[PDB]
Ligand binder design. Structure first.
Ligand SMILES: [Lu+3]
Ligand SMILES: [Lu+3]
Ligand code: NA
Ligand code: NA
Lengths: 244, 244
DNA sequence: AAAGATATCTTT
DNA sequence: AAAGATATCTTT
């Protein structure tokens, strides 16, 4: 399938290639820093050609946002059924030591999740799937030889601010949790779990409908949630009481 | 000086070199996307070696943050004068067309400027200067050819999602304005002005003392500010009224 | 101008 | 777990 070919290609690329710098048109190479913003950007850029290649091998049109701050990173559709769009969005987190539990921020719960055309490239109801490409890496403190510049013949001497990168491809709803992933920026939180649990899809929601209803009716603060619901057990009880 | 040599080095490097991709150790190149996060990341990485080079020339130790989400990008100090630290922080914004007005988010006003040890590498009172390296670029729409990978012999063929990059170095207080640069994340706003106004230092504060006091007593929402002050004129009146 | 969007982290 | 930090943008 498109999905299985895509993760196979991302999984293979990550095994075979290690990003180590930014390069200029005249051949000068600048190393990577350890800032979380650095690595998320690097993995996103690493993923773009792979996503496109696989999409094209399956006959899908590939579109990135035209406007800044619109979800998703990639919209795929076949021109013969333009209202069965696939959203693919790339997310990154870290571990301090290899294979500890991780969590992702899975997008806002007050933008396109509640408003069909808000912060989204196409209307939300044109998408039939929402895929997360998730990267996890183990952090590595920078070295001072990371403050030098390099030429193409020194590529293997450049220190990398990361190790143990792993990648997965999963549906957003499947890995969604019941606790917000941020406060002032009102993000959906993923399960808090090991990498394997994301691969295997060991989530909490019964259905994508239940995921959407949970996060459409999640209140923004602890005080507000306390009289409605704060977790999935309380939500399922709120539902049995008749959404009171 | 450290300052004059740094700005000269930053101007010369940006004239000379155009970043066009990320490179793997195996030699494969992945192009740049247009996302705002991408360019900011690339300009920061481009700047690191230049900052370290000039700082070392002038006998300054260079330290980047050890923890994520600490200001500033670079802390410089002479080993003999560890209580005269210089903060150098890199900021980026865009224009749609060449030489439009720009504005910057100049950091939080509720973290280190109100709590000496909050979200900062060293205590705020150990810094005697806060320099912004500001980057400005004009956006260029991405090409479909930004979705393939390239080799080291194709560097000039890679499309770039920017043009017209300009850089300045200025004191934070000098370019600061009186209107927040963000809402929920409570950032100081720069002046809203043309590039040369940043180079020349055409700000609104009389002194760094006035800059600090203004942003240390700025309330977080319009409603709360309407009984206090919303702009520099209203702040000067608040001072006259007796800081009440 | 004001506020809440973009992604992810740390603090409490 | 809650909420406000990290940088910058768009919508109001
Ligand atoms: Lu993205
Ligand atoms: Lu920075
Ligand atoms: Na790799
Ligand atoms: Na350049």
């Amino acid at each position: 399938s498109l999905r299985s070919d895509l993760i196979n290609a991302l999984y293979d690329e990550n095994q075979k290639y290690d990003v180590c710098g930014i390069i200029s048109a005249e051949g000068k190479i600048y190393p990577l820093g350890s800032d979380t913003k650095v690595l998320s950007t690097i993995f996103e850029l690493f993923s773009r050609p792979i996503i496109n290649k696989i999409a094209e091998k399956h006959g899908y049109i590939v579109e990135e946002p035209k406007q800044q701050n619109h979800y998703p990173d990639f919209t795929l559709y076949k021109p013969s059924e333009p209202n069965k769009k696939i959203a693919i969005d790339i997310k990154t987190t870290y571990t301090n030591k290899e294979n500890e539990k991780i969590k992702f921020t899975l997008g806002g719960y007050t933008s396109f999740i509640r408003n069909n055309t808000k912060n989204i490239v196409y209307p939300f109801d044109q998408y039939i799937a929402h895929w997360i490409i998730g990267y996890v890496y183990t952090r590595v403190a920078t070295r001072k030889s990371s403050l030098k510049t390099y030429n193409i013949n020194e590529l293997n001497e450049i220190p990398k601010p990361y190790k143990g990168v792993k990648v997965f491809l999963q549906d957003k709803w499947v890995i969604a949790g019941d606790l917000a992933g941020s406060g002032n920026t009102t993000n959906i939180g993923s399960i808090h779990a090991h990498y394997k649990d994301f691969v295997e899809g060991k989530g909490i929601f019964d259905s994508e409908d239940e995921f959407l209803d949970y996060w459409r009716n999640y209140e923004r603060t602890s005080q507000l949630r306390n009289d409605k619901y704060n977790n999935i057990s309380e939500y399922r009880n709120w539902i049995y009481r008749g959404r009171k």
